């Protein structure tokens, strides 16, 4: 009968979803909506579109195809989203993660995680960042933007069933409450249950991300972003000796990948609840103001019994239970200690920014000025066990209320962290060149109360950190650049003087080019860098139980990634990573490379969709991830092997049957069920890589 016809003229958001799997604009590297090429520093953006293709159970398994990031620090455990970016991590198995532009400050065991199903995009920013976020590990920082409301309707429920008794049920609904599309909302939630790859350990999670958006006019937004996630069980998190994993056991056989040195009654709970807003207001072509706030209370309970290496380990030398068996046995006998812990913590944080674009000569300005405030507190009531803490184990429950002062002790700590920083940044573009220049001063006060000792050590820091870079904008896309970035992170440890050490520092120089055309949605990026942490604490030469500052570690290398919508049926993602890490100035490990950080990493994946003929709708994906060999301890004693795993995808688009969008697909992780060890952080702390894992899903976008 009749007919209509449509037209063009584009524009993507840094906080919105990306047109394809190749993000074009980010904001977590300059705190400004900015096209990737124009960013003076390395960046990465794993799209929701991308994620919901591997059906990752966490943000960590979502960063598997991302350069300069090992997602194997704990192997197959997903208790935490712990990353090592460019051979570096925060300190104390702590993580450096941000959500919607604000740090998710954790502590000790209390660290929160956001499920990816609630995420719109997962960004990684490699290299120093104190220039914009304050204290942090040099080279490394994870920022995830939450799904936000959308103008158009969204009614989708998802069903996932997989191996190791996995059951998931999620739903993502979003819509506009009024005709003029001003009041919008979005409700995201899911329930997951599954047995940990290990044995005797399960993991269930229930999380609802309620978010509201108000837009009185068209130069103003206000979005309430809340998130409440409860997990009665977080899964395995124990330790396996290399004596049975990397290296074989005396009998000759190795422990199975589903082994568990734990006790039938180990438990790990974590409850996180947070609420905040993301405000944005444009006063006029020049002044614009933003503000991100959020407060969150999180708890983590735990009754775990982990395993300190086999008896013949230097770690157990002063062990009685161990040291009382025929030497022949010691080789296939595992020591074990435990931990009981109740933690609660609150974390508030606001960040008021003032974006100001103005002219001058032929150069345009994009000046940012802000105040960042952050406060956090975690109350700990833990209890530990040592050496003879728990029965041995060849290669059963466990009374946790034992608390035997002969091999057990209390750990009641109350940590306080606070940090106000100010900063200015100018994104100056002179027709063809873009000079980004900024600085930030931070006042980082910390205080720690040792409840079981009255001992209370505290400290305040004043650190200045800046950054500079240049980007040449070939009007064809390709953008070459180089930049200098600073970083710094304070120490929570005390010295022989009885005072907490000075903040360690991170300097980094980088050179690279980014290809981001206009024609197609492509993003090829390569880079070479040299990052160095200074004043890294090292052992006391005068033999002591205290550490000593004045150390240095070096991270140097190149990394290249590429994501793109080649056709309309082809999508390709890939990268290569080269990391050279080494102790430059250390008291006992000079010339050695830090444990768990691999030298080589590579990844490649592509899927093909059929649009014509019978297979119309079918999509076939396959890929691989290569991880180089690594050292299993600072002493660089033994080495963890190199492994390559393959992933695969099969997805039919039910639109060929009246249901557009909605599809049914099979996801396979580690196709050839490779049996591998992800890494070890020390001779006695190893982790098995994930065994083949199949997930069948049904997505319905009603």
């Amino acid at each position: 009968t009749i007919t209509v016809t449509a037209a063009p003229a584009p524009q993507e958001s840094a906080w919105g979803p990306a047109a394809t799997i190749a993000a074009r604009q980010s904001a977590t590297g300059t705190k400004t909506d900015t096209p990737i090429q124009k960013v003076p520093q390395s960046i990465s953006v794993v799209t929701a579109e991308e994620m919901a293709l591997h059906q990752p159970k966490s943000v960590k398994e979502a960063l598997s195809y991302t350069p300069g990031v090992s997602v194997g620090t704990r192997g197959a455990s997903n208790t935490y989203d712990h990353l090592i970016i460019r051979g570096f991590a925060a300190e104390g198995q702590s993580q450096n993660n941000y959500l919607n532009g604000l740090k998710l400050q954790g502590n000790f065991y209390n660290d929160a995680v956001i499920d990816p199903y609630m995420l719109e995009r997962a960004e990684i920013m490699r290299g120093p960042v104190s220039v914009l976020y304050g204290k942090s590990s040099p080279g490394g920082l994870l920022n995830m933007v939450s799904k936000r409301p959308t103008t158009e309707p969204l009614k989708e429920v998802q069903f996932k069933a997989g191996t190791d008794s996995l059951f998931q049920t999620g739903f993502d609904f979003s819509d506009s409450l009024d005709d003029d599309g001003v009041y919008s909302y979005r409700l995201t939630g899911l329930a997951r249950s599954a047995n940990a790859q290990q044995k005797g350990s399960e993991e269930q999670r229930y999380a609802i991300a309620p978010a509201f958006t108000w837009r009185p006019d068209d130069k103003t937004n206000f979005t309430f972003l809340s998130y409440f996630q409860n997990e009665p069980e977080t899964g395995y998190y124990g330790w396996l000796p290399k004596e049975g994993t990397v290296e074989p056991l005396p009998n000759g056989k190795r422990l199975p990948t589903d082994f568990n040195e734990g006790a039938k009654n180990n438990t790990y709970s974590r409850n996180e609840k947070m609420v905040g807003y993301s405000f944005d207001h444009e006063f006029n072509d020049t002044f614009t103001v933003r503000q991100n706030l959020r407060f969150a209370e999180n708890k983590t309970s735990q009754n775990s019994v982990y395993g300190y290496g086999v008896c013949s380990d230097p770690a157990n030398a002063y062990s009685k239970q161990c040291a009382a068996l025929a030497p022949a046995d010691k080789g296939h006998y595992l020591a074990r200690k435990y931990v009981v812990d109740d933690e609660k913590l609150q974390n508030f944080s606001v960040d008021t920014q003032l974006q100001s674009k103005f002219a001058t000569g032929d150069i345009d300005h994009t000046l940012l000025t802000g105040v960042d405030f952050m406060r956090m507190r975690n109350d700990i009531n833990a209890w530990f066990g040592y050496d003879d803490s728990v029965p041995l184990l060849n290669l059963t429950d466990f009374d946790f209320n034992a608390k035997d002062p002969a091999n057990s002790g209390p750990y009641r700590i109350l940590n306080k962290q606070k940090q106000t920083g100010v900063y200015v940044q100018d994104q100056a573009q002179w027709d063809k060149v873009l000079v980004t220049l900024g600085g930030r001063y931070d006042w980082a006060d910390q205080e720690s109360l040792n409840r079981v000792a009255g001992t209370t050590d505290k400290r305040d820091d004043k650190q200045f950190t800046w950054r500079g870079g240049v980007n040449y904008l070939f009007d064809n896309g390709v953008t070459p650049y180089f930049s200098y970035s600073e970083s710094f992170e304070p120490s929570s440890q005390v010295g022989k003087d009885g005072n907490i050490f000075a903040p360690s520092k991170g300097k980094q120089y980088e050179v690279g080019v980014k290809y981001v055309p206009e024609d197609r949605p492509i993003v090829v990026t390569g880079a070479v860098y040299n990052l160095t942490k200074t004043n890294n604490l090292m052992a006391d030469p005068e033999g002591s139980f205290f550490s000593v500052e004045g150390g240095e570690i070096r991270a140097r290398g190149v990394e290249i990634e590429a994501k793109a919508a080649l056709s309309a049926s082809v999508n390709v993602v890939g990268s290569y990573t080269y990391t050279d890490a080494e102790y430059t100035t250390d008291t006992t490990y000079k010339g050695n490379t830090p444990a768990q950080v691999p030298k080589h990493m590579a990844s490649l994946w592509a899927d093909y969709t059929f649009f014509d003929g019978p297979l119309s709708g079918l999509t076939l994906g396959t890929g691989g991830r290569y991880t180089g060999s690594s050292y299993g301890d600072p002493a660089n004693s033994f080495k963890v092997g190199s492994y390559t795993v393959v992933d695969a995808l099969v997805r039919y688009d039910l639109a060929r049957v009246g249901m557009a969008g909605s599809n049914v697909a099979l996801h396979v992780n580690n196709l050839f069920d490779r049996e591998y060890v992800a890494s070890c952080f020390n001779t006695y702390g190893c982790f098995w890589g994930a065994e083949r894992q199949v997930v069948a899903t049904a997505t319905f976008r009603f």
Binding site: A568, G617, A655
Partner: protein
């Protein structure tokens, strides 16, 4: 009678297609019985159209069932 928004993926890969919709009219202006006859290429504009025929509105009280439209999405060309 509004116009359907150009699908992102398409708006990005400079591609196009046509869509055959068949539908009804609820006695008050609105619409109902949304259906997609043919649509080359496959999954790409569907949902985009359904969502566009949501805020549609014209003659209340004079409905009719079974009416085809057929809409085509196009890119400048230059």
């Amino acid at each position: 009678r509004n116009q359907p928004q150009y699908p992102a993926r398409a708006q990005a890969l400079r591609i196009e297609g046509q869509v055959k919709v068949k539908f009804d009219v609820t006695p008050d202006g609105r619409v109902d019985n949304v259906q997609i006859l043919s649509a080359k290429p496959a999954n790409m504009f569907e949902r985009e159209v359904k969502n566009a025929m949501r805020r549609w509105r014209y003659e209340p009280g004079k409905p009719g069932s079974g009416i085809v439209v057929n809409i085509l999405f196009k890119i400048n060309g230059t």
